[PDB]
C-alpha cells in the first residue's frame, strides 16, 4: 500500500529487478561494484 | 692524423644514435599516458595536448644539443685542427 493521504491507502504493484561528461576512478573491478550496488538497491526498495 | 678522422664518425653515430633511442622510448611513455587520459576523458584533450608540448620541450632538449654537436663534428671537425 502507498500513502496517498492520511485518509487514503492505495494498493500497488511496483517492478523491482528489471529497471555523460566524466568517468569514475574504480578501485575494485566495475562488475564487482555494479553487482554489489544492485543488491543494495533492491533491498532498499523493499524496505521502503 | 689518419686515426682521428673516421673515428669521429663513431662519435657522431653515438651522438645521433643514443639521442634517437632515448627520444623514441620517451615519447612512447609520454604519448601512451596522453592517449590513456584522452580515451577516458575526451573533454580534457585540448588542455592535455598543450601539457604534452610543455614536456616535449624538456624531453628533447639534450637530444637537440647532441644532434647539433654531431652535425658540427661532421662538417667542421674541431679535432682535426688539434693534429
UniProtKB/Swiss-Prot annotation, chain A:
Stretches of the chain forming a coiled coil according to its record: none
Compartmental location: Cell inner membrane
Recorded family membership: Belongs to the ATPase gamma chain family.
Functional note: Produces ATP from ADP in the presence of a proton gradient across the membrane. The gamma chain is believed to be important in regulating ATPase activity and the flow of protons through the CF(0) complex.
Subunit architecture: F-type ATPases have 2 components, CF(1) - the catalytic core - and CF(0) - the membrane proton channel. CF(1) has five subunits: alpha(3), beta(3), gamma(1), delta(1), epsilon(1). CF(0) has three main subunits: a, b and c.
Protein name: ATP synthase gamma chain
Organism annotation: Pseudomonas paraeruginosa (strain DSM 24068 / PA7)
Portion of the full sequence shown: 173 to 229 of 286
Swiss-Prot record, chain B:
Any coiled-coil regions, as ranges: none
This protein's GO CC annotations: plasma membrane; proton-transporting ATP synthase complex; proton-transporting two-sector ATPase complex, proton-transporting domain
Bilayer disposition of the protein: Multi-pass membrane protein
Transmembrane segments: 10-30, 53-73
Alphabetical keyword list: ATP synthesis, Cell inner membrane, Cell membrane, CF(0), Hydrogen ion transport, Ion transport, Lipid-binding, Membrane, Transmembrane, Transmembrane helix, Transport
KW Amino-acid biosynthesis (keyword) present: no
UniProt keyword Cell inner membrane present: yes
Site residues (Reversibly protonated during proton transport), renumbered to this chain: 60
Family: Belongs to the ATPase C chain family.
Function description: F(1)F(0) ATP synthase produces ATP from ADP in the presence of a proton or sodium gradient. F-type ATPases consist of two structural domains, F(1) containing the extramembraneous catalytic core and F(0) containing the membrane proton channel, linked together by a central stalk and a peripheral stalk. During catalysis, ATP synthesis in the catalytic domain of F(1) is coupled via a rotary mechanism of the central stalk subunits to proton translocation. Key component of the F(0) channel; it plays a direct role in translocation across the membrane. A homomeric c-ring of between 10-14 subunits forms the central stalk rotor element with the F(1) delta and epsilon subunits.
Protein name: ATP synthase subunit c
Originating species: Pseudomonas paraeruginosa (strain DSM 24068 / PA7) (Pseudomonas aeruginosa (strain PA7))
